[PDB]
Design a protein around this ligand. Structure first.
Ligand SMILES: OC[C@H]1O[C@@H](O[C@H]2[C@H](O)[C@@H](O)[C@@H](O)O[C@@H]2CO)[C@H](O)[C@@H](O)[C@@H]1O
Ligand SMILES: OC[C@H]1O[C@@H](O)[C@H](O)[C@@H](O)[C@@H]1O
Ligand code: NA
Length: 358
């Protein structure tokens, strides 16, 4: 639409990922691959606020971005993910988080949001774009038979509402997470999904800062597939552009001028999964299309890298409390460490298999 949040801004490069990448590139023995790997630190990614312990880091990023903008004559933009719901990751085991509904989860989450707002309020010269709670709403469309998700539904909706309402007050541009084509893109799931997204947008007051939806976060689907991946049989919406073209008009029918962002950070290699539901550390993945606002679709504000490639999706160790068997499937890279920690061998393959090449 008329206001694309990225136009006219320079994106602040994540210091957290830059440090991971710098350490990783030194451990790659091939000298040519090492140089290509190091260049990944110059590609903008989203930084995840996956624990309340990271909120002070956010303050440092905003302050560094503000100084860089003043120094270089530019306006700076910081990309973050809000990812700390109580009873997080309700349909899986690998990314369970620090808060639980049973122990004051909603009140803890409201305090987490309040602390984030308090940091952002101090640096009004820096633009913030936020992805809100990957997986949460998609789980409430298709996974209400999962008891953990059913019991979390009212808390999830209240927490997401608190985030949207309060981040809007400090001018954050927000994209709510909307799954991916293999999850909500099935034709039969589009209407229930649209109804839920529009209800959340209405409850938060229809703020213009709620720009739209994010798709493919931490997944592997193509934006525009040359030919359908065989895992997609039965679903006419076999890539993200088909999903978005089918969903966007329904959000229009409700009065929401919604636009989209699409993760392509791990989408460079297609046709590598045995089943569409295999999400964990998929073997052979490569870095995909680099972030750009030249998207080819009226509905898409930007291609982005939301999930930082190299940070693990979940452990293959069956003795961990966060063991999910999806992470030990034949198409999952193993052995794998805990979700969120660095997975060096996976990063090296992402670099080697990048398409387009680095
Ligand atoms: O997309 C990453 C998230 O996947 C979640 O699993 C989804 C999966 O992506 C779908 O293809 C389908 O199989 O439904 C699953 C949910 O039951 C996974 O639970 C999350 O942890 C991932 O971040
Ligand atoms: O890598 C980005 C994020 O991925 C998730 O799967 C992990 O649970 C988080 O700890 C991590 O911040
Ligand atoms: Na996950």
């Amino acid at each position: 639409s008329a206001n694309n949040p990225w136009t006219g801004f320079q994106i602040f490069l994540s210091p957290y990922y830059a440090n991971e990448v710098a350490a990783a590139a030194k451990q790659i023995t091939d000298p040519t691959l090492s140089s290509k790997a190091a260049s990944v630190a110059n590609i903008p990614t989203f930084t995840w606020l996956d624990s309340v312990a990271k909120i002070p880091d956010l303050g440092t990023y905003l302050a560094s971005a503000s100084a860089l903008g003043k120094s270089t004559g530019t306006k700076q933009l910081v990309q973050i993910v809000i990812y700390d719901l109580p009873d997080r990751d309700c349909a899986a085991k690998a990314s369970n988080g620090e808060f639980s509904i049973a122990n004051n989860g909603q009140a803890n989450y409201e305090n987490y949001i309040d602390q984030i707002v308090a940091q952002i309020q101090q640096f009004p010269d820096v633009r913030v774009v936020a992805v809100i709670e990957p997986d949460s709403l998609a789980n409430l469309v298709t996974n209400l038979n999962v008891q953990k998700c059913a019991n979390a539904k009212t808390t999830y909706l209240a927490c997401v509402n608190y985030a949207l309402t309060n981040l809007a007050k400090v001018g954050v541009y927000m994209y709510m997470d909307a799954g991916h084509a293999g999850w909500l893109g099935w034709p039969a799931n589009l209407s229930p999904a649209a109804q839920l997204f529009t209800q959340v947008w209405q409850n938060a007051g229809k703020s213009p800062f709620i720009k739209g939806l994010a798709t493919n976060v931490a997944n592997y689907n193509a934006l525009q597939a040359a030919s359908p991946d065989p895992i997609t049989q039965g679903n006419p919406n076999y890539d993200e552009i088909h999903y978005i073209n089918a969903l966007a008009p329904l959000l229009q029918q409700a009065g929401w001028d919604a636009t989209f962002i699409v993760d392509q950070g791990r989408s460079g290699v297609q046709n590598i999964r045995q089943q569409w539901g295999d999400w964990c550390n998929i073997k052979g993945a490569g870095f995909g299309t680099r972030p750009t606002t030249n998207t080819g679709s009226q509905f898409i504000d930007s291609i982005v890298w939301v999930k930082p490639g190299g940070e693990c999706d979940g452990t293959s160790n069956s003795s961990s409390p966060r063991y999910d068997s999806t992470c030990s499937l034949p198409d999952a890279a193993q052995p794998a460490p805990e979700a969120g920690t660095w997975f060096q061998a996976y990063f090296q393959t992402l670099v080697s298999a990048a398409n387009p090449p680095l």
